Structures are given as structure tokens and as C-alpha cells.
Amino acid sequence: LQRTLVLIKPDAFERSLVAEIMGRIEKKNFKIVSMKFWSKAPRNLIEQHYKEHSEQSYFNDNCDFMVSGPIISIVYEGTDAISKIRRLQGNTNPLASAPGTIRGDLANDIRENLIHASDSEDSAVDEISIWFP
Amino acid sequence: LQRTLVLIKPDAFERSLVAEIMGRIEKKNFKIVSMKFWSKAPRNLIEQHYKEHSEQSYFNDNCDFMVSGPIISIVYEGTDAISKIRRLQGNTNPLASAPGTIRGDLANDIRENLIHASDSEDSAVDEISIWFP
Amino acid sequence: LQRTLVLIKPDAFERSLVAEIMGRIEKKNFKIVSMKFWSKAPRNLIEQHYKEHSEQSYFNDNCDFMVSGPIISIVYEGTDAISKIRRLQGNTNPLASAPGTIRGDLANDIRENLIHASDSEDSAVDEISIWFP
Amino acid sequence: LQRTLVLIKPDAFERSLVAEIMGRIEKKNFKIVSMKFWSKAPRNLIEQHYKEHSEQSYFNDNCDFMVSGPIISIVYEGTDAISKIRRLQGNTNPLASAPGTIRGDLANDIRENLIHASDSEDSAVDEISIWFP
Amino acid sequence: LQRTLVLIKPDAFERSLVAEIMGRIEKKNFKIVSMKFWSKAPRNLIEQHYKEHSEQSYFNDNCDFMVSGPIISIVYEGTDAISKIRRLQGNTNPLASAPGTIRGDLANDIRENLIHASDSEDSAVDEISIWFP
Amino acid sequence: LQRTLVLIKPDAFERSLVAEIMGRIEKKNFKIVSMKFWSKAPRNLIEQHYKEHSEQSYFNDNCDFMVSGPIISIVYEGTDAISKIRRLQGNTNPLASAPGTIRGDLANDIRENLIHASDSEDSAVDEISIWFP
Numbered sequence A, B, C, D, E, F: 001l002q003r004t005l006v007l008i009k010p011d012a013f014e015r016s017l018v019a020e021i022m023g024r025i026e027k028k029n030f031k032i033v034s035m036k037f038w039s040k041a042p043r044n045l046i047e048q049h050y051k052e053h054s055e056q057s058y059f060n061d062n063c064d065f066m067v068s069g070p071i072i073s074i075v076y077e078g079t080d081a082i083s084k085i086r087r088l089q090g091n092t093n094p095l096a097s098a099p100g101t102i103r104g105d106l107a108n109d110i111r112e113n114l115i116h117a118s119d120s121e122d123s124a125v126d127e128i129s130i131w132f133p
């Protein structure tokens, strides 16, 4: 049994895909254990969340997008939740994400890509600590 | 123009219908203003939410049900949101709830009825203050 | 509390709507008690099922349709299941069947109308005994 | 037996509901006879389509909306198609449109209401001639 | 043209996914040729069905699960039905089953995995003989 | 930003999957820029469209199928639309097309395979010129 941190990104709100995304996770039998809605996430939590990318060319553009509308931060629990939800999520690059995945079916951009999911046990603990201190 | 208070009830979690219900409201173009997840709502909060029912024979049984699993409380905003969401919700009684409504399609019990929605301007003000003080 | 008899009619098979119809009843939380698949129902069984219509001008044409492809017969159980499933079914006449109902959303003909459901306690008893002696 | 004229309005394109709307009509078993895509309909065509509303206070605002994005115009054929598609469409007013209908489930505005459908035999003849001369 | 044997497992009933699963197969254009509902499958047919696993550590636990609620046994027919339905089914291991498959989208356990499908021409004949003697 | 040519094939009309297919493309955020409905495509445009296959064993059978009912020709626009829509489409061979793709989920035949999509930048320009001269 693991916990992972998911963000529903502002493009999901703009495109009315919030329930579509949450539903794919719900249907796989993962359970919500914490959830917060942010009308606009503070820039500082976004920069902390994406700290590994802070020196990347896309960092500022990505943070700008992440504060451009609401987000939901959710902690999901289930056996091997981290890797399983990453598989459901799909590749960042829309030339790579597979049909059947969230990004493969619904996203068409490397930045506006609908959903964040923790990529490891340690990053899940880190991200949970940011959004649910 | 109006804000209303919605609860996603514990049966929605048991039956994995959280996204289904939220999605029906989302597709109608209502905006989330606030959202809280409760692993278990305090009984007192439930009793206050249903204070107008305190003399009804079903009061305690309904409170027991409402603390039997998680709840999500949501404030939705939209023109005439209160009455519109009530119509989407459907009648309490499963003999009457209309196909096409949330309860009409998904609920089969007078108590385990998936969703609460404020019934008026006066009660919306009260309920929002209870769940989001 | 009540048991009702449902038939999934041959048009549902032709139009690949079997799961769609069954799913609407399933989502309403009704329990399957018995289920039979018929590659072709015997005409006599159909005539007995519709015996109250034997003097109607449509009787033979309706029997012809009912033996034109497969049928699934199902006994569903639930509180007040008979009237509830009738309301989900929708009116026979495509001028009247309400959007949100099975027929309202999916049927466009008075005869090729996808689904049978018992109309009363008395007829449910009779029909269950016909299909599941 | 009857032919009716449907417009998929610019809000359906903005909100990515084109297939959702078309699918509801398709599932009802109506046949497409003609279909045109308009990147932007000429304003004059819109004014002619709504000529009976020319004296209403909303006339110009509604025309502005109708040329604000793409439209698909469709001729559908079926027995009593005109009234049946009107019932699927739902009432103009979001205080009244019934859950289960296109507008009841998906529209939340009197003007941005997703879909036009001819209201009578007389108007269907006129509208088909406007969109498909 | 081949026939394959599918079981809808008790977790599908518990989670109200019976029609969801049958629908995925229906949408791929496979046809039902036999179907039986079992309120509780006899233990002996379950042990016969899974005879290859009789000496495995998981055999008893799996049989226990398979008699823990209802099942449906279905024979499906279509060109290369066996391999095609196995592909739709997805890997037993939820760390392996791909998004888009039945198990990839809906199952989260190696045992409670929603659906059985025959794995070969000879096992299909064997399994059909068990459930439809 | 690229444009690609899609045909919705006659089997989609027969099986009432037109909106299902268009919806998968719509949900991926591709936009319609041209669309025509053909009650029956002229044989000559079909032969031109499939000119690369003119000497193949299956050419005539395929053309026969392509004029056996209506089609829709659609031009879709978006970043890397050509390759992305080809990935959504799935392999021609139903022993190869992956669950999650249009053909993987919905097609069960190498010829009656629901959808055409251009396979390259140059073939997209060629095909657009045929259907939208």
C-alpha cells in the first residue's frame, strides 16, 4: 500500500476534464485520502514542487502555466499506487504517450498535459509534504 | 451569481461514483469555488448541517450514514446555481427521482442518495458557513 | 423486496446496445437473480408472454420481431423494482419516451423498443414463471 | 418521414461537445441526410435563419454569438424527427431544460445553448432551404 | 470464426462493472452465443476450470474468491475471438496490464482481476464443455 | 501545426460509431477545419484516394466496401496531427491493433476498420486535394 501525489492541472479545468481524469483513477480502485482545491496555487509551492526542473529552459513557462488557473492536489492510496498511476498518466511527450493513457487520449502538448503524478516513493513523500504539510 | 453547497456522500465513495457525480455538474459548466475532502465528517457538523431535521424519525440514522465514510464538500458558483443543481440532483425518493438526474440514474434509496445540494438562498448561506467557516 | 422480469429484445443485439441497457439498470443498484440467453426464443413463449395482447392488431408483427434475433431474460430484485425499472425503461411510444430513459435515449420505434419490463406485481409473477419455470 | 435542420452552435466547438451532441442524436437512430461544416457562418445567413426573431431584444447579440466560431448544419431524417429532436434538445431556458436532454445536461445559458433544431414542419422546410439551397 | 469462454468474476458484480466489461467486448463486435448467470458457481466447476493451477500456492485462495459472489459464463464468437479477447483482457499482473485493456483500466489486483478468458483453442473447448455441457 | 485527412467509413455509420470516433479525436484537442458528408462517395474519388493500392488483391473489395454506405471526410488540424491521429487510429490488422486505439477497441476486420487517416505530410496534402479540391 503506497500513497502518491497527483495534481489536476489548470488545463483540466479549462477543458472540463477534471472528473474525466479523477474518474480514470477512481475506476482503477485507488482511493482518495487527502484532497485540496486551489483557486490559484501559490507560485512558491509550484516552484518547490518542480524544484528538480528549476534550471531548465521550460521552468518558468511551466510555473506560469501551473498558476494560470485552479488546481486540485490529491493524495491517492493503493497497492503500488505510484508506479500504477504513472502508467495511467502516460508519457510527457505527446508523440510518445499511448492511447488508453490519460495523456495519450486527452493531452496534445508537452506542457499542457493535464496531470502530475509523483515519480517515486521519495518524491511522493516530498510532494505530499508540500501540498499537505 | 449564486453559490450553492454540495456534499458528495459516503455511498458515492463506496460505489466509486465520485467522478461520475462531479462530472455531471462539471459538464453543466458550474465552477468550483471551494472544495474540501473529509475522511470522516465530525458528527456534530452533520447534525448542524441537518439541524432542520432534528425532530424527524430518520435524523439519527441519517447522521450515522453521513459519518460512515468520506464526504467531499464543494461550493459551486453559477447563475441560478442553487435551483439548477437541485434539478440535476433529483428527488430524494427513489419512487420519484427522474431518469437523467443523479439520483434518478444512480441512487436507489431514500437515505443513501449520493448527493446533498442546498435547497434555497437562505440555506446555501448557512451550509457554506458550516462547511467552509 | 420485489422481483421483476426484463427482456433485452432482439434490436438491442442488432444495434450492440445490450451492455448499454444492462448497465443503466446495474448503475441503479438492482441485483440480478436469474439470467438466461436465448439464441431465438420459441414463438409460443413469446405468444404467452404477450398473451394479453393477442387481440391487438400488432400482436403477430410484434411476435415476429421478438423471434427475429436473440433475447436475454433477466430477473432483477430490489425495493419497488417493478415500478422503478418501468420508469427507467420509458414509454412505449417514441413520441413520448423521455430523454434520460432507455427508450427515450436509444429507441425510435413503437415495436423495436429494446426492452421489456413487467408492469405490475401480478404480471411480474406470471412473466417470471414463463421465462424461468 | 420527416426531415429536420440541426445546427451545432459555436459553443459546442469551444467546449469540445460536438461529438457528444451528435452522438446523442446518432444513438436515437436518426439518419444524416446532409451535413455542412462552416468555419464561420455568414451573418446574413444567421439573420435569415433567425428572421422571426428580428424584433426581439436579443436578436443582434444572438447573431454575434452565432458567428463567433464554427457551426455544423445537419439535416436529419426519421419518423417524426422534428418533434423528437426538439425533445432531445431541451428547453431554451436553463431554469427549465430537463436533465437527460442536451441542454439540460450540457448548457447553462439561454443564448449559448449548444444546438438549434427546427420547431415545426413549416420551419424545417425553410431552414433546410437556407442551409442547403 | 472461433468461440472463447469468458467468466465475469465476482469482483465485477461487487464493483458494478459487469456491463462495463461486457460492453468492451460488445463494442469490438463479438457476439454472445451462450450465457449463464450463476448466483454462486459450484466449487467443483471452478476447480475443474482452473485445474492447471491445482498445485499452485494461490489455487485455494483463487477458488475461494471465485465462489465469493456471482459469476456469468459467456461464450463469445468472432474471427480469432480467443486471442483478441485475451488482448482486450490484459496481463494478470497489475504492474503489467496496459491502460486501454480491461484489467489495465479497471483491475488493481492479481487475483481480483474481473475477467477470465480462454487462453487457447483447446482450453476454450475444455472450458466451454465445463460451463455449457 | 499540421493538417490531416480522415475518412469515417461506412461501417461506422452502420454500427452507429460516427460520434464515438470523432469524439476520440475531439477529446485529443484536434480541431475540424473542413468536413463533408457523402451519402455515397463517388467510386472515382475512392480509387484516387487509394491509388497506391490499385494493383493489390484487396483493391476492388475495399473500394466496394467504401461505397457501400455514407462516409464523412474531415480535415483535422493540430500540432503533429498526422502522426498523432495515426497512433489513435491503430494497426490495420485486428491481430495487431492495441486496446485503447480506435481500431483496437472497436474494429474486428482488416477491411471494415472504421477510419482512414493520412499516413504522411505528402499523402495528407494529396488526400485533402481529392476530398476538398
Ligand SMILES: Cc1cn([C@H]2C[C@H](O)[C@@H](COP(=O)(O)OP(=O)(O)O)O2)c(=O)[nH]c1=O
Binding pocket: A053, A058, A062, A091, A092, A110, A111, A112, A113, A115, A116, A117, A119
Ligand atoms: C520535459 C519538459 C517538461 N515540461 C513541463 C511539463 C511537465 O509536466 C513538467 C515536469 O516535467 P517532467 O517531470 O519531465 O514531466 P512529467 O510531468 O511527465 O512527470 O515540466 C515542459 O514544459 N517542457 C519540457 O520539455
Ligand SMILES: Cc1cn([C@H]2C[C@H](O)[C@@H](COP(=O)(O)OP(=O)(O)O)O2)c(=O)[nH]c1=O
Binding pocket: B053, B058, B062, B091, B092, B110, B111, B112, B113, B115, B116, B117, B119
Ligand atoms: C425524507 C427523508 C430524508 N432522509 C435523509 C436523506 C436526505 O438526503 C436527508 C435530508 O432530507 P431532505 O432534505 O428531505 O432531502 P434532500 O437530500 O433531497 O434535500 O435526510 C431519510 O433518511 N429518510 C427520509 O424519509
Ligand SMILES: Cc1cn([C@H]2C[C@H](O)[C@@H](COP(=O)(O)OP(=O)(O)O)O2)c(=O)[nH]c1=O
Binding pocket: C053, C058, C062, C091, C092, C110, C111, C112, C113, C115, C116, C117, C119
Ligand atoms: C402499443 C403497441 C405495442 N406494440 C408492441 C411493442 C410493445 O413493447 C409490446 C407490448 O405493448 P405494451 O405492453 O403496450 O408496451 P410496453 O412494452 O411499453 O409495456 O407490443 C406494437 O408493436 N405496437 C403498438 O402499437
Ligand SMILES: Cc1cn([C@H]2C[C@H](O)[C@@H](COP(=O)(O)OP(=O)(O)O)O2)c(=O)[nH]c1=O
Binding pocket: D053, D058, D062, D091, D092, D110, D111, D112, D113, D115, D116, D117, D119
Ligand atoms: C428566448 C431567447 C432566445 N435567445 C436566442 C437563443 C435561442 O436559441 C435563439 C432562438 O430562440 P428560440 O427560438 O426561442 O429558442 P430555441 O433555440 O430553443 O428554439 O435566440 C436569446 O439569446 N435570448 C432569449 O431570451
Ligand SMILES: Cc1cn([C@H]2C[C@H](O)[C@@H](COP(=O)(O)OP(=O)(O)O)O2)c(=O)[nH]c1=O
Binding pocket: E053, E058, E062, E091, E092, E110, E111, E112, E113, E115, E116, E117, E119
Ligand atoms: C498467477 C496467479 C494467478 N492467480 C489467480 C488469478 C488468475 O486469474 C487465476 C489464473 O491464473 P492465470 O491463468 O495465470 O491468469 P489469467 O487469469 O490471466 O489467465 O489465478 C493468483 O491469485 N495469483 C497468481 O500469482
Ligand SMILES: Cc1cn([C@H]2C[C@H](O)[C@@H](COP(=O)(O)OP(=O)(O)O)O2)c(=O)[nH]c1=O
Binding pocket: F053, F058, F062, F091, F092, F110, F111, F112, F113, F115, F116, F117, F119
Ligand atoms: C492491407 C490491407 C488493406 N485493406 C484495405 C483496408 C485498408 O484500410 C485499406 C488501405 O490499406 P492500408 O493503407 O494498408 O491501411 P490503413 O487503412 O491502415 O492506412 O485497404 C484490405 O482490405 N486488406 C488488406 O490486406
Ligand SMILES: [Mg+2]
Binding pocket: A119
Ligand atoms: Mg515529473
Ligand SMILES: [Mg+2]
Binding pocket: B119
Ligand atoms: Mg434538503
Ligand SMILES: [Mg+2]
Binding pocket: C119
Ligand atoms: Mg407491457
Ligand SMILES: [Mg+2]
Binding pocket: D119
Ligand atoms: Mg426556435
Ligand SMILES: [Mg+2]
Binding pocket: E119
Ligand atoms: Mg489462464
Ligand SMILES: [Mg+2]
Binding pocket: F119
Ligand atoms: Mg493507408
